[PDB]
Design a protein around this ligand. Structure first.
Ligand SMILES: COC(=O)c1ccc([C@H]2C(C(C)=O)=C(O)C(=O)N2CCc2c(C)[nH]c3ccccc23)cc1
Lengths: 35, 270
């Protein structure tokens, strides 16, 4: 491949081997329950 | 920039400032053609960005010396020549630049930025207790009302002013009853009844609405993030430091050492 257009997370473990681009959407982490 | 970096006076008798506080002698060399020397009084800076700088100095093992700038606030070129922080970085008078600096496409073509470490955008704080729906409501887009909700703050030669003047010429045309000072004067002008809506950055408005007697409320905060961007460090074009400190910053956001700084330095009652 030559690029990734997908919801890819940015973190330390990737930044050493990949050169990202400025974020286009910010988000975090949540948990799912039935209600 | 009121939570991010704070400048104060040295010790009453010692002169060596408080532990965990960085000496920062501002350059006030307003004239050197016919001026001998401006006395660089030893002030000491403390805050959030300085804390990040301390962590970076410990991690990537460098040495620094802060000096405040006295040509403009952040930067808006007056027909070809820049000013402020970006101006200093572009003309190679400083290797780095830290503080309250926004990411755009206007200046990211001239200097090199880091991965953002603070989330920011544009927000609209209203007087008291929503009334407007943001930058799409007919009131802001079309200034022709009999009751003309007027004068979003938008301190001149800033970053948000560039967005306003580039996208919507009507708002920039009407909004001339602005404030000539920072958020400190704008908020008290609003509290006195001068203008009922303030349009500015996101983090500073959120903090100022957090630290207030009672509190004044912004429009819907989760939806009050318009044209989202981030803060960052500005460096010279393609320097080898960008490879290192970038990674360093990411490490912080992975280990939660930036999380504790949020609790310590950015908190309010309301
Ligand atoms: C002229 O020297 C300085 O002024 C200076 C510079 C850095 C630090 C501190 C730093 C803080 C709190 O600022 C520490 O936490 C820390 O780890 N520092 C440097 C550590 C360091 C190592 C191991 N090696 C180095 C090589 C060059 C420079 C520094 C180092 C202290 C003083």
């Amino acid at each position: 491949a030559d690029m990734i257009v997908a919801p890819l997370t940015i973190n330390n473990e990737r930044a050493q081997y990949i050169e990202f681009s400025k974020p286009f959407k910010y988000q975090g982490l949540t948990i799912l329950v039935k209600k | 920039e009121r939570p991010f970096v704070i400048v104060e006076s040295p010790d009453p008798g010692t002169g060596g400032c408080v532990p965990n506080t960085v000496p920062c002698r501002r350059q006030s060399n307003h004239t050197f053609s016919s001026g001998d020397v401006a006395p660089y009084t030893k002030l000491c800076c403390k805050g959030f960005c300085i804390d990040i700088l301390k962590k970076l100095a410990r991690v990537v093992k460098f040495s620094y010396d802060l000096y405040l700038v006295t040509n403009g606030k952040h930067g808006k070129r007056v027909r070809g020549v820049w000013n402020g922080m970006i101006g200093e970085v572009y003309y190679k008078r400083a290797d780095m630049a830290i503080g309250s600096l926004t990411i755009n496409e206007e200046r990211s073509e001239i200097v090199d930025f880091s991965v953002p470490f603070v989330e920011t955008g544009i927000s609209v704080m209203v007087a008291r207790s929503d009334t407007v729906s943001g930058l799409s409501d007919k009131k802001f887009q079309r200034p022709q009302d009999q009751y003309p909700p007027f004068r979003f703050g938008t301190v001149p030669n800033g970053s948000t002013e560039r967005n306003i003047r580039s996208n919507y010429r009507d708002m920039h045309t009407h909004m001339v009853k602005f404030n000539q000072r920072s958020v400190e004067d704008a908020l008290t002008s609003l509290k006195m009844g001068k203008l009922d809506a303030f349009i500015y950055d996101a983090a500073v408005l959120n903090y100022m609405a957090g630290k207030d007697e009672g509190c004044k409320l912004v429009t819907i905060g989760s939806g009050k993030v318009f044209a989202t961007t981030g803060y960052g460090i500005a460096m010279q074009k393609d320097s080898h430091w960008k490879r290192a400190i970038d990674l360093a910053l990411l490490q912080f956001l992975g280990d939660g050492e930036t999380q504790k700084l949020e609790t310590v330095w950015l908190s309010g009652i309301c």
